[PDB]
Amino acid sequence: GFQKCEQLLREYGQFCSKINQALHGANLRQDDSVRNLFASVKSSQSSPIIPGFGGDFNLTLLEPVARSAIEDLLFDKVTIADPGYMQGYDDCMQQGPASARDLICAQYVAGYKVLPPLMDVNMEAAYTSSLLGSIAG
Amino acid sequence: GFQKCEQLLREYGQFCSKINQALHGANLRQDDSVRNLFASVKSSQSSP
Amino acid sequence: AMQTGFTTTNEAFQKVQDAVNNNAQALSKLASELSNTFGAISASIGDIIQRLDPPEQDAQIDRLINGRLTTLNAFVAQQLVRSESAALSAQLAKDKV
Amino acid sequence: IQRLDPPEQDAQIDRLINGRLTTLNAFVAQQLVRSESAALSAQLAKDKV
Amino acid sequence: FSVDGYIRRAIDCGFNDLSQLHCSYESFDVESGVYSVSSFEAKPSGSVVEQAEGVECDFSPLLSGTPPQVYNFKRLVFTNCNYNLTKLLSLFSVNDFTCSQISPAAIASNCYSSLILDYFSYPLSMKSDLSVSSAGPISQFNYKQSFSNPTCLILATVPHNLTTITKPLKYSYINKCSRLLSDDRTEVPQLVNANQYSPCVSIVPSTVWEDGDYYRKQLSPLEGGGWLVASGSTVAMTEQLQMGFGITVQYGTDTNSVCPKLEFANDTKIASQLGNCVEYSLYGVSGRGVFQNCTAVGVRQQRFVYDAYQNLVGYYSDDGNYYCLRACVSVPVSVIYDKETKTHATLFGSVACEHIYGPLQTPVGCVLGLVNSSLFVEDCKLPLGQSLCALPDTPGEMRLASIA
Amino acid sequence: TVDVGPDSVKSACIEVDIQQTFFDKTWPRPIDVSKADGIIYPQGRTYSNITITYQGLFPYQGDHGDMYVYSAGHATGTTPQKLFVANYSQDVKQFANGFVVRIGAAANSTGTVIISPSTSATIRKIYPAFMLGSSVGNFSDGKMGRFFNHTLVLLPDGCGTLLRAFYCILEPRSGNHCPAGNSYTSFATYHTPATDCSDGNYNRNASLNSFKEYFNLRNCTFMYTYNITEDEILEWFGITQTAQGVHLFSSRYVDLYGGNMFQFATLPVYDTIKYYSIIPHSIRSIQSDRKAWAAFYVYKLQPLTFLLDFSVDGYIRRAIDCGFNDLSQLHCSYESFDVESGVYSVSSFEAKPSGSVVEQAEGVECDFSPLLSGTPPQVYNFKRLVFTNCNYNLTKLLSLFSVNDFTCSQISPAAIASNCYSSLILDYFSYPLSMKSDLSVSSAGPISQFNYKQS
Amino acid sequence: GFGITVQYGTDTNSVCPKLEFANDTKIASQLGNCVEYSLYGVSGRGVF
Ligand SMILES: *[C@@H]1O[C@H](CO)[C@@H](O[C@@H]2O[C@H](CO)[C@@H](O[C@@H]3O[C@H](CO[C@H]4O[C@H](CO)[C@@H](O)[C@H](O)[C@@H]4O[C@H]4O[C@H](CO)[C@@H](O)[C@H](O)[C@@H]4O)[C@@H](O)[C@H](O[C@H]4O[C@H](CO)[C@@H](O)[C@H](O)[C@@H]4O[C@H]4O[C@H](CO)[C@@H](O)[C@H](O)[C@@H]4O)[C@@H]3O)[C@H](O)[C@H]2NC(C)=O)[C@H](O)[C@H]1NC(C)=O
Ligand SMILES: *[C@@H]1O[C@H](CO)[C@@H](O[C@@H]2O[C@H](CO)[C@@H](O[C@@H]3O[C@H](CO[C@H]4O[C@H](CO)[C@@H](O)[C@H](O)[C@@H]4O[C@H]4O[C@H](CO)[C@@H](O)[C@H](O)[C@@H]4O)[C@@H](O)[C@H](O[C@H]4O[C@H](CO)[C@@H](O)[C@H](O)[C@@H]4O[C@H]4O[C@H](CO)[C@@H](O)[C@H](O)[C@@H]4O)[C@@H]3O)[C@H](O)[C@H]2NC(C)=O)[C@H](O)[C@H]1NC(C)=O
Ligand SMILES: *[C@@H]1O[C@H](CO)[C@@H](O[C@@H]2O[C@H](CO)[C@@H](O[C@@H]3O[C@H](CO[C@H]4O[C@H](CO)[C@@H](O)[C@H](O)[C@@H]4O)[C@@H](O)[C@H](O[C@H]4O[C@H](CO)[C@@H](O)[C@H](O)[C@@H]4O)[C@@H]3O)[C@H](O)[C@H]2NC(C)=O)[C@H](O)[C@H]1NC(C)=O
Ligand SMILES: *[C@@H]1O[C@H](CO)[C@@H](O[C@@H]2O[C@H](CO)[C@@H](O[C@@H]3O[C@H](CO[C@H]4O[C@H](CO)[C@@H](O)[C@H](O)[C@@H]4O)[C@@H](O)[C@H](O[C@H]4O[C@H](CO)[C@@H](O)[C@H](O)[C@@H]4O)[C@@H]3O)[C@H](O)[C@H]2NC(C)=O)[C@H](O)[C@H]1NC(C)=O
Ligand SMILES: CC(=O)N[C@@H]1[C@@H](O[C@@H]2O[C@@H](C)[C@@H](O)[C@@H](O)[C@@H]2O)[C@H](O[C@@H]2O[C@H](CO)[C@H](O)[C@H](O[C@]3(C(=O)O)C[C@H](O)[C@@H](NC(C)=O)[C@H]([C@H](O)[C@H](O)CO)O3)[C@H]2O)[C@@H](CO)O[C@H]1O
Ligand SMILES: *[C@@H]1O[C@H](CO)[C@@H](O[C@@H]2O[C@H](CO)[C@@H](O[C@@H]3O[C@H](CO)[C@@H](O)[C@H](O[C@H]4O[C@H](CO)[C@@H](O)[C@H](O)[C@@H]4O)[C@@H]3O)[C@H](O)[C@H]2NC(C)=O)[C@H](O)[C@H]1NC(C)=O
Ligand SMILES: Nc1nc(=O)c2nc(CNc3ccc(C(=O)N[C@@H](CCC(=O)O)C(=O)O)cc3)cnc2[nH]1
Ligand SMILES: *[C@@H]1O[C@H](CO)[C@@H](O[C@@H]2O[C@H](CO)[C@@H](O)[C@H](O)[C@H]2NC(C)=O)[C@H](O)[C@H]1NC(C)=O
Ligand SMILES: *[C@@H]1O[C@H](CO)[C@@H](O[C@@H]2O[C@H](CO)[C@@H](O)[C@H](O)[C@H]2NC(C)=O)[C@H](O)[C@H]1NC(C)=O
Ligand SMILES: *[C@@H]1O[C@H](CO)[C@@H](O[C@@H]2O[C@H](CO)[C@@H](O)[C@H](O)[C@H]2NC(C)=O)[C@H](O)[C@H]1NC(C)=O
Ligand SMILES: *[C@@H]1O[C@H](CO)[C@@H](O[C@@H]2O[C@H](CO)[C@@H](O)[C@H](O)[C@H]2NC(C)=O)[C@H](O)[C@H]1NC(C)=O
Ligand SMILES: *[C@@H]1O[C@H](CO)[C@@H](O)[C@H](O)[C@H]1NC(C)=O
Ligand SMILES: *[C@@H]1O[C@H](CO)[C@@H](O)[C@H](O)[C@H]1NC(C)=O
Ligand SMILES: *[C@@H]1O[C@H](CO)[C@@H](O)[C@H](O)[C@H]1NC(C)=O
Ligand SMILES: *[C@@H]1O[C@H](CO)[C@@H](O)[C@H](O)[C@H]1NC(C)=O
Ligand SMILES: *[C@@H]1O[C@H](CO)[C@@H](O)[C@H](O)[C@H]1NC(C)=O
Ligand SMILES: *[C@@H]1O[C@H](CO)[C@@H](O)[C@H](O)[C@H]1NC(C)=O
DSSP: OOHHHHHHHGGGOSHHHHHHHHHHHHHHHHHHHHHHHHHHHOOSSOOOOOTTTTTTSOOTTTSBOOOBHHHHHHHHTSOOOOOOTTTHHHHHHHTOOSSTTOTTTTHHHHTOOOOOOSSOHHHHHHHHHHHHTTSOO | OOHHHHHHHGGGOSHHHHHHHHHHHHHHHHHHHHHHHHHHHOOSSOOO | OOTTOSSTTOHHHHHHHHHHHHHHHHHHHHHHHTTOOTTSSOSOHHHHHHHOOHHHHHHHHHHHHHHHHHHHHHHHHHHHHHHHHHHHHHHHHHHHO | OOSOOHHHHHHHHHHHHHHHHHHHHHHHHHHHHHHHHHHHHHHHHHHHO | OOTTSOOOOOOOTTSOHHHHHHHHTTSSOOOSEEEEEEEEOOOOSOEEEEOOOSOBOOOGGGGSBOOOOGGGOEEEEEOSEEEOHHHHHTTSEEEEEEEESSOHHHHTTOOBSEEEEEEEEOOGGGGGGGSTTBOSHIIIIIOOOOSSSOEEEEEEEOOTTOTTBOOOSEEEEEEEEEEEOTTSSOEEEOOOOTTSOOGGGGTSOSSOSSTTOEEEEEOOGGGTSSEEEEEEEEEEOOSSOEEEEEEEEESSSSOOOEEEOOOOOTTSOSGGGTTSEEEEEETTEEEEEEEEEOOOOSOGGGOEEEOTTSOEEEEEOTTSOEEEEEOOOOEEEEEEEETTTTEEEEEEETOOGGGOOOOEEETTEEEESEEEEEEEESSOSSEEETTEEEEOOOOOOEEEEEEO | OOOOOOOOOOSBOOOEEEOGGGGOOOOOOOOOGGGTTTOBOOTTOEEOSEEEEEEEEEOOTTOOOEEEOOEEOOEETTEEOSEEEOSOTTOOEEOTTOEEEEESTTTTSEEEETTEEEEEEEEEOOOOOEEEESOEEEOTTSOEEEEOSEEEEEEEETTTTEEEEEEEEEEEOOSBTSTTSSSOOOOOEEEOHHHHBOSSOBOTTHHHHHHHHHEEEEEEEEEEEEEOOOOOOOEEEEEEEETTEEEEEESTTTOTTTOOBEEEEEEOOOSOOOEEEEOOEEEOOOGGGOOEEOOEEEEEOEEEEEEEEEOTTSOEEEEEETTSOHHHHHHHHTTSSOOOSSOOOOOOOOOOOSOEEEEOOOSOBOOOGGGGSSOOOOGGGOEEEEEOSEEEOHHHHHTTSOOSOOBOSSSOHHHHTTOOBSEEEEEEOOOOGGGGGGGSTTOOSHIIIIIOOOO | OEEEEEESSSSOOOEEEOOOOOTTSOSGGGTTSEEEEEETTEEEEEEO
């Protein structure tokens, strides 16, 4: 926010335009990557998952509880900071940083932003759930 | 080994920590790549 | 047997954690580099302005600019490398499904 | 150090630092590019075997 | 610019977020999409200031008796006091007042951890010998200023009516200072370090009797053996005594408690502005942020609490409270733009709408310009994140649609 | 100057018995950085609940330091006699960057009475006394330990209730057993508990008065006292020196139980301290009341990078000396006390010089004689002397002229007179001093434009 | 006025202050050791 700095920054050309455009393209790339990947996981036809799916083969691990049990375990066991997509701005003010070097609260201080993913969790779960039900057939 | 330089180097942050960690990871990557590659070339059964 | 799988001996599991750690590292570059002075008297532009007159003030602000422009270029270069890698990987995932 | 006093000595050492930091960043960037490439290539080798 | 050079159309790049977008691409037509633009800045609503307030820093010693020679300069160190350079400068006829690594305006107005004042008798005729670039006897053997800390040098003449400062018989200096090693073949010049005294000070008398006097001390084995030798020189005394004053200031070894005096308003207190974004200056430490009342952490005696990235994150105030310090936080901005309709919506990602049809709270932040539609799409061109999509009305307002 | 009370009126000093054998004990207490021994807290700030590296003056991990122990003097029943000391006053050390002291570490343990090895007693904390200064040498009989000019003396007194700091000239007294007198051995301080340490009124000048028996205090510029609450708690003391003066650090006013040192005083001592010594102290206890006094340990400081673990309350409880070993370097590079298993590259083990080799041209002096003979040329006709393959001495030339202005550019002042060159080119000419500025690089006047310009 | 200009590497840097030499600063006497060197103005560290 310092005007003297901004005045000197201008002598380096459209530096920030380049930073923004490069990241914008890089970010579009994931939305396109995700869209393409899920378009391909998507089943045409699938059977419903019902409790008992698998018969004598115990697939309860994979059945939706909705994410599956293994899927929730996989997420619970990985340490991931919560980006605060809906109201992180406020969490970092009313509670403040969770710990030293909190990179989520650093966003509003340093000048960077973590963007949300293209699909929410329930949609991704829907894709793999429909995939599960399509395997046998 | 010059102390004056090291004193000035410190004002650039943990530069060398970044260099070392980046290369350490890059080097682990080959040990993992090699281990995985050979695990797959490995035969279960073979004739002499 | 896999219910007990998500532990220290599960290579696939560490790869999941490492993907997460890589995202954190990418953000740590921006969070940690603003405290550097890059040879300047302060990492704070406000301190430079408050202490120095324009002919020297300029040089000090400029050191901070060069350091920060460098940091952002490095960041972007890595986001492009990482996004290219993830995209190739996504096509591998496509093939495996 | 032998030729200059601190206010100028600093500027000269700093030029060498900037150049060397730049060199190391370039080196690392390439080791990461080259190791990423080799890793992809290794998976190709895996498939060919 | 048209072919004929006239400006017919323009964008004010700071007007809104849509305008910022056009400027970043240097075009009046940009493609549809969701773009990040500069954040909406929080601005200060006031300021808080805390400074040491109390005792004046005492320059009295300086004004009483005969000042020392340049190699015996006396040092006054000021900490935890209110300084006023005019108060001292106004007592002398200043001949030359210059500063290095600090501006002129700053020397008289900033807060310091310490201010060190070195005063001595000094002929004005040798003015240049105090220059950093000088290779003469003063800078090599008598007095040298810091290269690390900001410094000022004042050369001034004592007025005829400032009768409390007396004159030495002559000005004097060391023109040689060296060690003779035990072999008595090698002689090593002993240069003075910045802010220190020459090793020959102990052999050179407070006044050199006459130009050319040679001094010698036998050194003990603990001192490396050999001899320390020096030669003095003199300058005839002037009608009015000429004096040098070196000033060295440090900015962060302690609370920066050496400050100009300040008359405080009670609207610059922290307690009265909690929760607001304010500019602050706390014992020389400054920046912008939001103060909050909170549980004390860190060592109280040290006043300023820092985080792992060296930001100031807390402060122990002289009013007895501990405050947490948060940055004034900017509000994220993304522009949702549709080229075909020439319409847009603004997303404040991660922000509750309490800080911003009225605003719509969504799973990805607060969005203005969208209307909630309870409609589903598959064909989403302006994804917002999660499973949300901006859908243009086609023009009307964009609808907030969910991806099916 | 400061009045520090009257001179001693005694004609003699108490005889001092120096028997170093009795003080040659092995009671090692090296710095344990993992327990944060010897750490001076970062001075202008605090931190909470973080681990960071920090650059500052710290003792080395594993440093044993120098142990010093004070003892009881000689006695015969109820009448104390001769003082009993170690050879400390003569053991002068280089100050360098200062030091930290571990005080009272052995308190509450059963120890030894040094003067009587077979006698045991509970160990009590005792405070160290120091003499510091710019220059040292010997006394009248050739023994070392004399300090010249102003000397800083840190002398605890009041049976351990005050620290007295003063900067003064120490003038050796000439009486019997005094440093400028007859059967001198070592000066020492003492107190006599029987009369000096009454339950109520402690003699706050007991050690000062004994010091004064050996030296007259002259031109004192200051004398400050600091109060110490009595306890048997291990504490740290430290001393450093900057342009602002001598800084005294202590753990007892901020982190009494923890041990981190904080500054409590700055003394107006501006000459550089180069040397220090321990002032031996001997307690004139009766034979039947000898105590064991805790040894103190002095450790030297140096500019090291440490990994410092700041607790929620801000104290440093744990640290890594990042230059101690390769494992320590690893922890510092990740700024953590816990790093993952693996094989890591760390800084190489440097080869260090074992000596030096020098070759220089040695021979003919470079000849500045032409310069000194006849009328010098005008500025536009300057004459040039080019010196190659010769020994130069600028003083030899400079000393022949009254130099009005000598400045250098792109070379330091120290360097111009000391470095080797491929060539030295000397351009000399007549030049009025009134046109001094016209030779400046920035000048646009006639000299710099049409007559003479430097490279 | 006296102008002084110095050059640092067009030839052996043979314009030096005079030095009294010790015979422990010879190269032949320190072969195989790491030493600091100053040879006609050229300096650094190394093993001869
Ligand atoms: C840092 O340190 C510097 C130096 O110490 C401080 O600067 C000084 O600040 C003081 C004010 O605090 C300032 O005093 C002012 O001086 C002027 C000048 O008047 C002189 O000349 C007139 C000529 O007519 C004389 O009549 C007058 O008596 C003075 O004469 C002096 O010299 C002669 C010899 O020639 C001596 O014989 C005299 O004794 C004397 O020394 C005054 O006019 C001014 O007066 C106003 O303020 C005072 C406040 O007490 C008030 O009582 C007066 O009635 C008058 O106030 C009215 O007018 C003002 C507008 O001017 C208006 O605002 C009010 O509301 C009233 O209507 C006062 O005495 C001194 O000169 C400064 N010196 C220097 C060198 O700068 C600086 O402040 C310090 N900084 C900090 C932060 O503390
Ligand atoms: C670069 O170029 C510069 C300049 O040419 C060189 O610096 C010179 O170095 C020489 C030494 O090599 C140095 O000479 C020394 O001078 C002092 C000063 O004494 C003068 O004053 C006393 C006052 O009591 C007189 O008694 C004395 O005679 C001198 O008087 C001079 O001036 C008067 C007029 O006022 C004339 O009438 C006189 O004739 C004279 O010109 C001497 O005290 C010193 O003497 C010691 O060394 C000599 C060596 O020959 C020895 O013989 C003496 O006995 C004595 O040595 C003892 O004491 C020393 C400790 O001091 C101890 O170490 C020994 O072991 C002995 O116990 C000597 O003559 C000259 O002043 C310097 N000049 C300048 C300007 O710096 C520099 O060396 C060159 N660099 C290199 C690398 O070559
Ligand atoms: C830092 O500390 C050092 C060490 O203490 C001081 O150096 C000492 O300085 C004093 C004097 O300043 C030396 O003491 C004596 O100085 C006499 C000077 O003579 C003149 O002044 C006297 C004053 O009464 C007159 O009587 C006399 O006529 C002169 O006008 C010398 O004459 C003395 O010499 C005696 O001892 C020598 C020893 O060889 C004999 O040969 C003589 O015949 C005679 O007996 C004496 O020198 C003192 O010696 C110095 N000490 C050392 C160890 O060198 C520094 O001055 C002090 N520095 C500062 C800046 O305060
Ligand atoms: C020789 O022997 C003496 C005693 O005979 C030892 O002195 C004791 O040392 C211990 C440890 O340093 C002291 O214990 C500390 O006491 C602190 C305050 O105690 C005061 O206040 C509490 C209430 O807050 C009272 O209950 C108590 O009686 C005192 O009035 C505590 O705050 C400290 O706890 C802090 O540190 C510990 C870790 O050590 C943490 O776990 C705590 O959370 C907290 O951070 C601690 O309890 C003890 O009080 C001292 N005695 C005296 C009389 O003071 C000497 O140390 C020993 N000497 C040697 C060399 O060994
Ligand atoms: C006849 C008489 O009164 N003699 C006194 C000594 O006591 C007698 O002789 C000794 C051998 C014992 O057997 C006693 O039981 C006997 O009555 C008295 O002796 C001192 O006794 C202590 C123990 O109580 C010990 O033996 C003393 O020796 C040392 C010591 O304390 O270890 C020897 C040390 O090397 C010496 N230290 C130094 C640095 O020299 C000390 C020191 O001299 C004393 O502690 C001084 O107070 O003594 C032994 O001397 C003796 C002193 O109390 O006086 C005799 O008159
Ligand atoms: C024990 O040690 C302490 C050091 O902590 C030492 O303290 C000193 O005491 C003397 C007095 O005995 C103080 O000197 C006095 O200070 C006052 C301050 O206002 C002066 O007014 C006094 O001046 C009068 O007396 C002088 C005596 O010669 C006269 O010359 C003069 O004209 C006045 O009549 C006098 O200067 C001294 O300041 C303190 N020092 C410190 C550092 O506090 C104490 O004396 C020692 N006690 C013993 C018994 O030795
Ligand atoms: N008068 C007096 N003062 C004392 O300080 C004193 N101290 C002791 C005991 N001193 C000590 C000190 C350290 C160790 C000790 O245990 N050291 C370890 C080695 C520690 C290391 O080097 O890391 C050991 O095993 O010996 C024992 C006794 C006995 N009498 C005394 N008597
Ligand atoms: C001091 O820092 C530690 C981190 O080293 C905090 O411990 C963390 O607390 C959070 C709270 O949600 C837990 O989720 C983490 O798993 C804890 N980490 C560890 C390593 O235990 C500790 O709470 C901090 N203390 C204070 C008072 O803030
Ligand atoms: C004072 O006493 C000490 C300790 O006895 C002496 O230091 C010892 O000197 C011998 C000499 O060979 C060394 O071998 C020892 O290793 C030294 N001890 C220590 C702990 O370093 C000291 O030199 C004596 N000083 C004087 C001036 O007599
Ligand atoms: C120490 O203080 C004394 C007195 O303040 C200084 O002055 C000398 O004092 C003695 C006392 O007997 C007189 O005989 C001298 O004639 C005095 N000399 C002068 C020049 O007045 C003494 O100079 C001071 N010493 C130092 C080293 O500062
Ligand atoms: C250091 O301790 C001394 C001794 O307790 C304090 O001096 C006492 O101050 C009280 C104040 O009422 C007097 O009544 C006593 O008579 C004084 N004692 C003596 C021996 O003079 C001293 O003030 C303390 N210093 C500080 C800075 O607190
Ligand atoms: C000193 O004070 C007197 C008092 O009358 C005055 O006349 C004189 O001009 C003053 N001198 C200076 C230099 O101010
Ligand atoms: C705040 O400042 C005003 C200014 O006049 C004063 O009247 C009021 O008493 C002050 N309040 C306090 C608490 O000092
Ligand atoms: C800060 O909080 C403490 C307790 O949480 C309280 O007692 C104190 O008065 C508060 N201070 C302010 C300025 O509100
Ligand atoms: C839009 O309105 C519907 C009402 O059916 C509500 O369920 C939905 O959450 C709303 N969306 C937002 C972002 O408010
Ligand atoms: C030091 O000792 C020598 C002889 O041992 C004696 O001549 C000299 O005067 C002594 N120095 C002092 C300061 O007494
Ligand atoms: C080496 O130096 C010593 C110093 O005295 C000298 O005696 C010896 O003769 C020298 N050796 C040679 C070969 O010159």
